[PDB]
Amino acid sequence: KVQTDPPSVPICDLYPNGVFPKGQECEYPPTQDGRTAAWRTTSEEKKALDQASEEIWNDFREAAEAHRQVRKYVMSWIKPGMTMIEICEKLEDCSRKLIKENGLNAGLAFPTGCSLNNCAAHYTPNAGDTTVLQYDDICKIDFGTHISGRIIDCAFTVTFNPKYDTLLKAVKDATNTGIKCAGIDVRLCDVGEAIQEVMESYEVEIDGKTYQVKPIRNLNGHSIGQYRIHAGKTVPIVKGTRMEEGEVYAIETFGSTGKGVVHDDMECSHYMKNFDVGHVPIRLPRTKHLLNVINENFGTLAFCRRWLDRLGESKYLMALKNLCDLGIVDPYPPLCDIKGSYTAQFEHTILLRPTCKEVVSRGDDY
């Protein structure tokens, strides 16, 4: 079984023995002592702990291989002139197929971000959005896959005009620096200070204006948990708690030519249940129904309005507002820097395995 062009074969079927490709494996950085962390690689007890979780790492790897194959496909066809809806639907159709979508056991971890220009995060079109991708746009493609709630959160930036090349390089460098600095017992604020230093070492010129690239100070990387995109630890991307063995992190950075701060803007598309809210009885019929739909289809994973539409739901906006007002669901609106600014993002998921650091979502692309 080989992969088709366009891709349509589940990653499952490409690896029938259920053993999926590893990502980039790295020795942990030297300790603050100045001494090596390489002992973890060859420690018999760390090897045992690591193997005890091989099923889990393998689930992440299946999800990451789906992510790699989806994004290579996206990069081959994404072009100005396509609607944002067309882009997201074409991406998601591929993602569903390769992940072998199966209820809450395998599927899409969160909606496809395609945030444009000064918008950095959490834009995906709602129904009727006529927005078309433009030649001068800078588009952040941020999408997620999961197997058994083991989530790959991984993102890149798309451009067509070379004027943004150095901005993209700054952010890629910053993200890779954060990944490099990450490790067991490493302080989160230190990972963030390293990212800032690299990002701000770049100056760029766009349409005759110069800028020192700024990290977006109120966006940040995060720990990841089972069915939990943000498990409660945050990684700053400006100057300001430790990472721990067995944790999983999304290392993302955002660079901006604007103020380096984002605000909520535009219509909301992204929503997610509050992870910590349990059973809440609801009699209101449309609200009750929508919560049941959400519980069945998404659980604690994020969703968007288009995904409710595709399930055949309609007249749900008041019901959704009700769930938000009750605190059962939280809205995650688009996050934008100032009008006229440009933002870029790169993001990987990393596994802090007992023996090594695995950049599980690394590809030959980024």
Interface mask (CB under 5 A) for Mn ion, residues 289-328, using x and -?
----------------------------------------
- The item of ligand 6KP, Mn ion, none sharing an interface with residue 155, based on CB under 5 to 8 Å by kind, is Mn ion
In the complex, the residues that contact ligand 6KP under the rule CB under 6 A are: 110-111, 153, 222, 229-230, 250, 270, 272, 302, 332
Interface of this chain with Mn ion, residues 213 to 252, rule: CB under 5 A:
250
- The item of Mn ion, ligand 6KP, none sharing an interface with residue 258, based on CB under 5 to 8 Å by kind, is none
209-to-37, 167, 198 alpha-carbon distances in Å:
44, 13, 21
- Both tokens of 34, joined, read 């100045």
Interface mask (CB under 5 A) for Mn ion, residues 329-358, using x and -?
------------------x-----------
- Phi and psi of 217, rounded to 5°? -70, -25
- The item of Mn ion, ligand 6KP, none sharing an interface with residue 255, based on CB under 5 to 8 Å by kind, is none
The rounded distance, in Å, linking the Cα atoms of 150 and 213 is: 33
Q: Which residues are within 8 A (CB) of 93 and not within 5 positions of it... i.e. 6 or more apart? A: none
Annotated active-site positions, please? 142, 153, 222, 230, 252, 347
263 among annotated binding-site residues: no
Q: Which residues are within 8 A (CB) of 173 and not within 5 positions of it... i.e. 6 or more apart? A: 198, 199, 202
**For residues 335 and 305, is the Cβ–Cβ distance under 8 A?**
no
222 among annotated binding-site residues: yes
Min dist. Cβ of residue 224 to ligand 6KP (A): 8
CA neighbours within 13 Å on the CB side: how many for 112? 26
Pick one of 59, 62, 153, 190: the residue that binds Mn ion (CB under 5 A).
Answer: 153
The rounded distance, in Å, linking the Cα atoms of 69 and 61 is: 12
| Angle between helix 188-199 and 165-181 (nearest 10) | 160
- The item of Mn ion, ligand 6KP, none sharing an interface with residue 272, based on CB under 5 to 8 Å by kind, is ligand 6KP
Residues that constitute the known binding site: 122, 142, 153, 222, 230, 252, 347
Residues that constitute the known binding site for a divalent metal cation: 142, 153, 222, 252, 347
